Amino acid sequence: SQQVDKIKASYPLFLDQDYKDMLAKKRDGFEEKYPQDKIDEVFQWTTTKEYQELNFQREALTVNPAKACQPLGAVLCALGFEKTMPYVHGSQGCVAYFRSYFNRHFREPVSCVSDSMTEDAAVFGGQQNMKDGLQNCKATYKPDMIAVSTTCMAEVIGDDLNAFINNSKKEGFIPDEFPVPFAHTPSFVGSHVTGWDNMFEGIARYFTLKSMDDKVVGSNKKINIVPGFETYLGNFRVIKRMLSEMGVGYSLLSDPEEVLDTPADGQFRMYAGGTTQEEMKDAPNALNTVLLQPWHLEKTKKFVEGTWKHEVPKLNIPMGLDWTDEFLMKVSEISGQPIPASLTKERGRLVDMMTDSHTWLHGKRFALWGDPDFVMGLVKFLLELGCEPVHILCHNGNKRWKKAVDAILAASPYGKNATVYIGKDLWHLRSLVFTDKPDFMIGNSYGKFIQRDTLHKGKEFEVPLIRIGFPIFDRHHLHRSTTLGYEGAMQILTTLVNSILERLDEETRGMQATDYNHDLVR
């Protein structure tokens, strides 16, 4: 039933007694459900150290991963180039999923095509799909560049992308000068960040490998900036803002911030902004190339050093105070531009906020996950704030990365209770937040199910989620935020301290029970 002036959606409609009675009858009549006492027993068991040890003995089963597959990252990379259509050679189901995954995080259109290979291609390969696909795409969507990656079906059958694209041009399906950079992006290797690296290196190769003879390092007086897999609009924007503040000439290579934030003005804009083809062609002439997320830009690094002959600086992601400092100092060294007063003041405003909020942050314990560079930057900043990052999970991390984070932790008294996990998933993390309970989780929207699980054990066991990372699907417009630079550090600090104070207010809101500590001033 409904009352027309107060219509109920699923919540709370299905809490009405008739719906409750119906659901009880469905269960008892036909579901052959385990008894509630047994469900409770197994639930309790899943919160124990005994269960944790079995859970961490897994070798074959993955549960609730914290990574995605390569072509997702190739698509995001390709989107950062002017009038460029991401194009994934292989099965079309993948492309529906890539688009919808990004649709939900950015709340924006996400343009990407497939060439719709089907079962028959296992006999004869996907060459004809590539020929017709490139021609159809260029004619229909009028890109100026098509950036080609692969799905796993095309990788298993072994399609030679290079030959297929060359043959598409030779046979007249597209003009030979039309740019079609490509990268093999097998989903069974690495993760979505590897696909970004592979795609970027392929685009870099396409525009520079065969034209190096006339290049001179430093002749265009600019610094190249490679952002890597990046899903906060504020991070592209803050890097450009800081470099412009310093008067530093730069080229941001892969810049989707315009096409992921077009206005709603009556027109749909399939393309907007982006790195130009000329910026990629001219990039070897930069003074140097800075990699903002070096732990997933290894192939790009080898090409930029081996072919462009740039001496890529040893910089961490510019997150937190020390590593934003180091980024600005290195950019100043390379460019010859001084750090301007405006950025020095911004730094001291971040330090001011740290002194103002340090008493609520001190000793707070966190579980956190994400991609390697993001996680290590968050760990570093938490240590700078006097916080304890006790459970650090990077499903797509590697042993060298783990060693580097362990060294960062060992250098700080705030790292003494911290453990770094690689190759583990959010079902592993669920155990850890039961057996060694932290104050908060910092992670993406998949963390909400862990918070739900912990509350079921009891209010005193609940671990609230703080949403920082990718994907964030159950809040709106957090993709506009910043995590890099002083600005991003200010945003993270503010989110952390106010999450602490929100939770404290909740715990002290009880009239005549806990509200003795429900202070107006904090």
Binding site: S10, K26, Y34, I39, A60, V63, K67, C94, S100, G266
Partner: protein
């Protein structure tokens, strides 16, 4: 728009294509005509997509894992292959269920074999066997396992049916191998069929000679309702108020025991024909169980369905049917009185998957609205047959529409509202056209039944009449 205008629009839009794609896409675009009731005389469907044109379709894995198997709440479904497929589809579909997630129910979790290159080189059957043992240790209350194959499985020659047989025997466990690799078929549709056949071959006959279930003359099953936002619950309540006993729901909020009890029912009630007509025909052939199509979108269709269903039983059910209709009459009449004046005359274009592009037309018309164009990602010609009857004369019909086509049709027809998916939503909002998601219900619903009609009406009104749509043009431009 007149037939002549629509035909001219179709040809104008097709001018952009290369010849081969132009000739193909012309076969998938049509203008409804009452003199042509056989869809195979006017539109082609269930064919390959043309490369590079930005189809909105998914794959067979989405059809099998997404709708048929994944919602079954007390089984664990393995996304078998690399990490992508299971992650992009994790909890994206709102197949509502009652359970204790991670303990006795598992729908919103993502179980996967996370194939690495070593698994491509050596095969994944050993990994799959080890994975099953780990599932049994860590999730002891699971009541069965399914293996949802992703693209690499069949391409590298793995034998998941052998693993499923051997491990199922070892553990006395129902383990269902599903060969729903995305390279199979042309869309989600073949995934439905493959998944139906897997139900048939591995689960449905389990209780064929078991007589311990006490049946009644009023036992039915809900076939093809994936309980989006509780849609199946808002249908079940009506069927049981009418005196029927819903023994099973396939697959929203479903359970493996419900599936196994379904051959005991007296009538299969099919909502989504596209995805479960296969198993419904099988159950009629094998068990003699009749099936019928019904429609619980809007009061007109819901009333028609209840009456048609009740007519299959006896006077006692028909009496309760009219009592249900009388109970809810004031409720939907009040929804109409509030919202139809606010929506009358407004024109809708739809594009969805395999059922809803025709099934929701009556609900729009119950609010005085008109569906002036519709189409499907992956319907077959028997779907288009049913569609031509529901849609008006001279309306536009599109099969496997391209992004370019959909945008250009919308620019010309200028609908007041568009109902489609997440990949379409933000395009049309930027054009200033109110948009409602008609897969996820835009995180609202249920839309089925009388209780769902109220939510549907509130939702079309909140979006179509929203103040934001008057604000897209800057006052200085």
């Amino acid at each position: 728009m007149s037939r002549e205008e629509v035909e001219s629009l179709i040809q104008e839009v097709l001018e952009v294509y290369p010849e081969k794609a132009r000739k193909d896409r012309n076969k998938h675009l049509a203008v409804n005509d009452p003199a042509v009731t056989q869809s195979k005389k006017c539109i082609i469907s269930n064919k390959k997509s043309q490369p590079g044109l930005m189809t909105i379709r998914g794959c067979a894995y989405a059809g099998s894992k997404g709708v048929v198997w994944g919602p079954i709440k007390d089984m664990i479904h393995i996304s078998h292959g690399p990490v992508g497929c299971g992650q992009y589809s994790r909890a994206g579909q709102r197949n509502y269920y009652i359970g204790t997630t991670g303990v006795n129910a598992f729908v919103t979790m993502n179980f996967t074999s996370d194939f690495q290159e070593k698994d491509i080189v050596f095969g994944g059957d050993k990994k799959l066997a080890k994975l099953i043992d780990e599932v049994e240790t860590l999730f002891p209350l699971n009541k069965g396992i399914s293996v949802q194959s992703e693209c690499p499985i069949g391409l590298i020659g793995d034998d998941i049916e052998s693993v499923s047989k051997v491990k199922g025997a070892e553990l006395s466990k129902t383990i269902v191998p599903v060969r729903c690799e995305g390279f199979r078929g042309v869309s989600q549709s073949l995934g439905h069929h493959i998944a139906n056949d897997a139900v048939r071959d591995w689960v449905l006959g389990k209780r064929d000679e078991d007589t311990t279930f006490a049946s009644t003359p009023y036992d039915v099953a809900i076939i093809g309702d994936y309980n989006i936002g509780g849609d199946a619950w808002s249908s079940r309540i009506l069927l049981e108020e009418m005196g029927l006993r819903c023994v099973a729901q396939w697959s929203g909020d479903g359970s493996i025991s419900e599936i196994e009890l379904t051959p005991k029912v007296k009538l299969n009630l099919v909502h989504c024909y596209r995805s479960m007509n296969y198993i419904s025909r099988h159950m009629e052939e094998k068990y003699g169980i009749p099936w019928m199509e019904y429609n619980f979108f809007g009061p007109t269709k819901t009333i028609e369905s209840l009456r048609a269903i009740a007519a299959k039983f006896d006077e006692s059910i028909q009496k309760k049917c009219e009592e249900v209709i009388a109970k809810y009459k004031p409720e939907w009449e009040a929804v109409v009185a509030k919202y139809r004046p606010r929506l009358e005359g407004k024109r809708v274009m739809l594009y969805i998957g395999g059922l809803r592009p025709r099934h929701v037309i009556g609900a729009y018309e119950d609010l005085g609205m008109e569906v002036v164009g519709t189409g499907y990602e992956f319907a077959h010609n028997d779907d288009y047959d049913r569609t031509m009857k529901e849609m008006g004369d001279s309306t536009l019909l599109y099969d496997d529409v391209t992004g370019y086509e959909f945008e250009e049709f919308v620019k010309r027809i200028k609908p007041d509202l568009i109902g489609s998916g997440i990949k379409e939503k933000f395009i049309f909002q930027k054009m200033g056209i109110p948009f409602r998601e008609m897969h996820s219900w835009d995180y609202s619903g249920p839309y089925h039944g009388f209780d769902g009609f109220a939510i549907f009406a509130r939702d079309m009104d909140m979006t179509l009449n929203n103040p934001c749509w008057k604000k897209l043009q800057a006052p200085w431009e």
